[PDB]
């Protein structure tokens, strides 16, 4: 199965890595990682695909790679309208896609509490 | 030759183009096809390692095939050639011989890749589905989905159905 | 390329429904297509699929023998009929475009869904 | 302004191919040449329809 | 209840040479062989060609008049020519080991 | 290898002299042999392919092996007669590895086209008859000519011949 | 691929030391390993001929690669550089495109000699036995040491057992 | 690297016996054992051998299911278990060494045996 | 099935050759032949291992071959101590290694 981190955050303008990773083996460029962005209330986005494919629509400061067994997305200059739910696909042998859990990436724009 | 395709499988199925190699499955609830998808992954990578390898196996270095001889050495040029036009009978008779094999044993490689799919099955449902030719097989019992997605992944647990079929089977 | 899915809703167990999907700005007869739920306080899960001209269909292991997903062309949509549903059924559903990969002559399901929807909430109970 | 690996008296050959059949006479890392027209080779399998 | 195990078909016309049996219809192929070029001359290495246009090798290495077009180059990766160039040697007469020099100045650091 | 010629058939036939594949009946009628006509000649086309391919893929160009060479030029004489060896040995190694390759696919091919008749001709009869070995069948019941006609023809009529069987059978 | 290695029969017996395909028998009277010795050395035989006929099949003469030319030469210097890149060429695709072939070629021989030997199994227990899967099987009738040992030797002998398997069978 | 038997002597018809061997100067882990017997009046017989790790066991066609050898590699011993024996079990036995050979990885026994035992005198007599 | 000869008979420093065939066939290389020497109250000794192939503590006089599609070893010299049975083990696809009847050197 995919394991992410259940959250991160980062401040504006900072760079940030997410990572995706198989409970019980290596993801490889042959599994295919695809990072998707979902925001509350639209429809779930291809950020990336492939291992570091990005559309043309979807702005540059996204992009991904294979680094230590592990999928890879970074967000270089995280603006504000990055706060969003991204979710790690993988490919095995099959139309069914595995998932990630999730993880929720907080711009902080607030002190701490 | 395994005698899986053009043998007891006359031909291809056109509606299943997800695929290599799959199932079509008639029931009450409906029929559907449902391409097999680890030994189409499986096939995909060996033909994909055979390509690749008939490819990228010939690296050369920066040459300058083209000479140039004035009349008083034909020798020379007569060598070169002889050179030049050996070379090209042995590729032109490596490469034409070569490809020709390899489509041959791709062709029996997905006989053989059906050939395998058949087998699987049959020793799954043995004694509780008939085969009816044309390469398949027609139950003694009553298979919803899940028997048929059963089949399918590899786990068809043949003893909970074995009563029935032999109820009805001894007819 | 936008995707709009409808016909979700309250059920009582053991109902049914018919979730479906309108494309525009594309045709559906070169494209394949996937239902995804994403169930409360749990990651996406993968529920059913279908390929480029409908004829093969896949179904997770949770939801086969209930569940039927099929394709409508001359109407653009998607249907999901959902039989016999269970508690475990409440979630959001989206559903997803596979990007077009074609691997030796064959359709892919490589690269992911390049097109969702934004989702439909279907919840049952027993109260 | 190309950037070719290959280079016949009519043109370069962009080639990660193993054979060619444009001319004999070459410059550069090429591939090797055949007196053939037709070298494809099979990756699916035999259409039944 | 039946289940029925298939492969796949297409409207493919693509033909293959087989040992065994010659014009076998197939669902896919690859091309092992190039038959198409570019059309036009491109660098090598990175470093392009030295064009001489209307001279010769012993015309431009001799300066012949009407070379002067030619840009000053500090290093080709080889040299193209006209299958009959017209201004070579002005002054007729025999150029000693001509193609020993072509070979010589094909490509030059 | 397929476990049909060496294998399950021990050994040939050599009053069937019109065919490589055959069959071998005995009825109250009478015993006799039958070559089968498709798949001996499907394996006369397939080897004659093969022998054409290796034989009409070499097409050479008029060419003069041998040079002259005075005593003032020996490092000519010693490359020319380095590129005639080279030559010489591609060709030798070439040759005697495909020979030696392609001579192992024929048997296997014979081989493969044997076990396919046997399956065949299995499959046909299924419980009707019996195997007992030498690749041959015992049948349940009485076959005549038309029978095992109808054996080789393709079209057994395995129904007709089913309840008949069972009496033999359960006995 | 025949289906046998890595098909139905999973994985290899770190315990079988002395042959390549063999048997474990699991009686009263004890479980044991018993290579099968025919059929390894018949596979020994036929690798030892393959890799023989790759070795001693390069017959070559006594050469000097290598010439001296001076800067007055060097269309020379190309043309022996030449002959040289083209043999080493020629031989490095030849030799790794030809192993890479045999190696096939070497595991689906293994698979098939196991696939052989089982259907030889198969064949010779008939009904007597009941595939229970991993492909081997579990008798219906209790074999002592002397079964086994005829089962692997070749002759099983199933009418003598065919009444108490029947009546075990039918229950 | 001596090899020395014991355990042998007169048994009645029907009866058992334990063979023992004893290997001085060598382990038998790595080492396929076999039993050679010689009858009085005929020459040497294959009765039993037994491979190197232990797993692989073979018997005679005459002596199959009455004998059982076995390895002991803690005692350095090798056993040989008679069991139902007859009149035509009288002989004199030895306990030989495979020769060490290694064919493509796999132990062969085509060099014959290179250290032998003494031998014990096995008599079956009825009355 | 190994034929050997129930008994010969050597004179001292003489040279003589024993000989070891099947019954129904050829021997070869491929066979392994192995000659093993018994002498009463001793463990037997393998003189000879492979068609030629000879132990160091083994003296030098014994010496193995093939001809005439049978396995032969020869005594060059034969002392008194070579006055043993003298055993063909060859070698037939499996661990049943056949072995001779025995041949009986007398040293005279």
């Given at each position: 199965?995919v394991?992410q981190?259940?959250?991160?955050?980062?401040?504006?303008?900072?760079?940030?890595t997410?990572?995706?990773?198989f409970?019980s083996?290596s993801v490889?460029?042959?599994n295919y990682?695809?990072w998707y962005?979902?925001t509350?209330?639209?429809?779930?986005?291809?950020?990336?695909?492939?291992?570091n494919?990005?559309?043309?629509?979807?702005?540059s400061?996204?992009?991904?790679?294979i680094?230590?067994?592990?999928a890879t997305?970074?967000?270089?200059g995280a603006?504000?309208?990055?706060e969003?739910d991204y979710f790690?696909?993988?490919?095995?042998?099959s139309?069914?896609i595995?998932?990630?859990?999730?993880?929720?990436?907080?711009?902080?724009?607030?002190?701490k509490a | 030759?395994?005698?899986?395709?053009?043998?007891?499988?006359?031909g291809?199925?056109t509606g299943?183009?997800?695929?290599?190699?799959?199932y079509?499955?008639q029931?009450?609830?409906?029929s559907g096809?449902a391409?097999?998808?680890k030994?189409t992954?499986?096939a995909?990578?060996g033909?994909?390692?055979?390509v690749?390898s008939?490819?990228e196996k010939?690296?050369?270095?920066f040459?300058?095939?083209?000479?140039?001889?004035?009349?008083?050495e034909?020798?020379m040029?007569?060598?070169?050639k002889?050179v030049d036009?050996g070379?090209?009978?042995?590729?032109?008779?490596?490469?034409?011989?070569?490809?020709?094999?390899?489509?041959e044993?791709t062709?029996?490689?997905?006989?053989?890749?059906?050939?395998?799919?058949?087998?699987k099955?049959?020793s799954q449902?043995?004694?509780?589905?008939?085969?009816?030719?044309?390469?398949?097989f027609?139950?003694?019992?009553?298979?919803?989905?899940?028997?048929?997605?059963?089949?399918?992944?590899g786990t068809?647990?043949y003893?909970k159905?074995?009563?029935?079929?032999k109820?009805?089977?001894?007819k | 390329?936008?995707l709009?899915?409808?016909?979700?809703?309250?059920?009582?167990?053991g109902?049914?429904?018919?979730?479906?999907?309108?494309?525009?700005?594309?045709d559906?007869?070169?494209?394949?297509?996937?239902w995804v739920?994403?169930?409360?306080?749990?990651?996406?899960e993968?529920?059913?699929?279908?390929?480029?001209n409908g004829?093969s269909?896949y179904?997770?292991?949770?939801?086969?023998?209930?569940?039927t997903?099929?394709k409508?062309?001359?109407?653009?949509?998607?249907?999901?009929?959902?039989?016999?549903?269970?508690t475990?059924?409440?979630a959001?559903?989206?559903?997803?475009?596979?990007?077009?990969?074609?691997?030796?002559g064959?359709s892919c399901?490589?690269?992911?869904?390049?097109?969702?929807?934004?989702?439909?909430?279907?919840?049952?109970?027993?109260? | 302004?190309?950037?070719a690996?290959?280079q016949?008296?009519?043109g370069?050959?962009?080639?990660?191919l193993?054979?060619?059949?444009?001319?004999?006479?070459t410059i550069?890392?090429?591939?090797?040449?055949?007196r053939?027209?037709?070298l494809?080779?099979?990756?699916?399998?035999?259409?039944?329809? | 209840?039946?289940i029925?195990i298939?492969?796949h078909?297409?409207?493919?016309?693509?033909?293959?040479?087989?040992?065994?049996?010659?014009?076998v219809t197939?669902?896919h192929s690859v091309?092992?062989?190039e038959?198409?070029?570019?059309?036009?001359?491109c660098?090598?290495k990175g470093?392009?060609?030295?064009?001489?246009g209307?001279?010769?090798?012993?015309?431009?290495?001799l300066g012949?008049?009407?070379?002067?077009?030619?840009?000053s180059?500090?290093?080709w990766?080889?040299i193209?020519?006209?299958?009959?160039?017209?201004?070579?040697?002005?002054?007729?007469?025999?150029?000693?080991?001509?193609?020993?020099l072509?070979?010589?100045?094909?490509s030059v650091?």
């Amino acid at each position: 199965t995919v394991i992410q981190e259940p959250a991160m955050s980062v401040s504006p303008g900072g760079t940030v890595t997410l990572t995706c990773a198989f409970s019980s083996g290596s993801v490889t460029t042959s599994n295919y990682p695809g990072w998707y962005q979902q925001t509350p209330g639209q429809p779930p986005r291809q950020v990336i695909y492939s291992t570091n494919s990005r559309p043309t629509v979807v702005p540059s400061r996204f992009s991904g790679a294979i680094s230590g067994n592990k999928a890879t997305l970074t967000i270089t200059g995280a603006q504000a309208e990055d706060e969003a739910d991204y979710f790690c696909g993988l490919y095995k042998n099959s139309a069914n896609i595995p998932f990630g859990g999730g993880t929720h990436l907080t711009v902080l724009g607030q002190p701490k509490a | 030759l395994f005698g899986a395709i053009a043998g007891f499988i006359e031909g291809g199925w056109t509606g299943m183009v997800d695929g290599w190699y799959g199932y079509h499955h008639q029931n009450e609830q409906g029929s559907g096809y449902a391409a097999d998808q680890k030994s189409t992954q499986n096939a995909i990578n060996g033909i994909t390692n055979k390509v690749n390898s008939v490819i990228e196996k010939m690296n050369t270095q920066f040459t300058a095939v083209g000479k140039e001889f004035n009349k008083l050495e034909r020798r020379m040029e007569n060598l070169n050639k002889k050179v030049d036009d050996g070379f090209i009978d042995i590729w032109t008779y490596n490469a034409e011989l070569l490809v020709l094999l390899e489509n041959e044993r791709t062709l029996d490689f997905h006989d053989s890749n059906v050939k395998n799919l058949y087998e699987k099955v049959k020793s799954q449902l043995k004694n509780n589905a008939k085969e009816i030719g044309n390469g398949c097989f027609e139950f003694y019992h009553k298979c919803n989905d899940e028997c048929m997605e059963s089949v399918k992944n590899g786990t068809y647990d043949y003893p909970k159905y074995s009563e029935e079929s032999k109820l009805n089977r001894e007819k | 390329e936008k995707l709009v899915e409808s016909g979700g809703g309250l059920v009582q167990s053991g109902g049914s429904l018919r979730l479906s999907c309108v494309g525009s700005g594309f045709d559906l007869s070169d494209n394949a297509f996937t239902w995804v739920r994403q169930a409360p306080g749990k990651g996406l899960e993968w529920v059913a699929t279908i390929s480029t001209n409908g004829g093969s269909t896949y179904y997770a292991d949770s939801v086969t023998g209930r569940f039927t997903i099929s394709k409508d062309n001359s109407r653009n949509t998607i249907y999901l009929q959902m039989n016999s549903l269970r508690t475990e059924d409440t979630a959001h559903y989206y559903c997803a475009r596979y990007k077009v990969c074609h691997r030796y002559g064959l359709s892919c399901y490589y690269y992911g869904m390049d097109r969702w929807g934004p989702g439909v909430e279907v919840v049952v109970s027993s109260a | 302004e190309c950037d070719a690996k290959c280079q016949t008296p009519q043109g370069a050959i962009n080639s990660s191919l193993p054979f060619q059949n444009v001319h004999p006479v070459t410059i550069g890392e090429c591939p090797k040449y055949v007196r053939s027209a037709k070298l494809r080779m099979v990756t699916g399998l035999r259409n039944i329809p | 209840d039946t289940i029925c195990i298939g492969y796949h078909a297409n409207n493919s016309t693509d033909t293959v040479d087989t040992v065994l049996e010659k014009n076998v219809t197939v669902t896919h192929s690859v091309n092992l062989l190039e038959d198409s070029h570019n059309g036009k001359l491109c660098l090598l290495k990175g470093i392009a060609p030295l064009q001489l246009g209307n001279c010769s090798v012993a015309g431009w290495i001799l300066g012949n008049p009407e070379c002067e077009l030619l840009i000053s180059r500090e290093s080709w990766s080889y040299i193209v020519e006209k299958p009959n160039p017209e201004n070579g040697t002005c002054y007729p007469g025999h150029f000693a080991d001509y193609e020993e020099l072509r070979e010589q100045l094909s490509s030059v650091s």
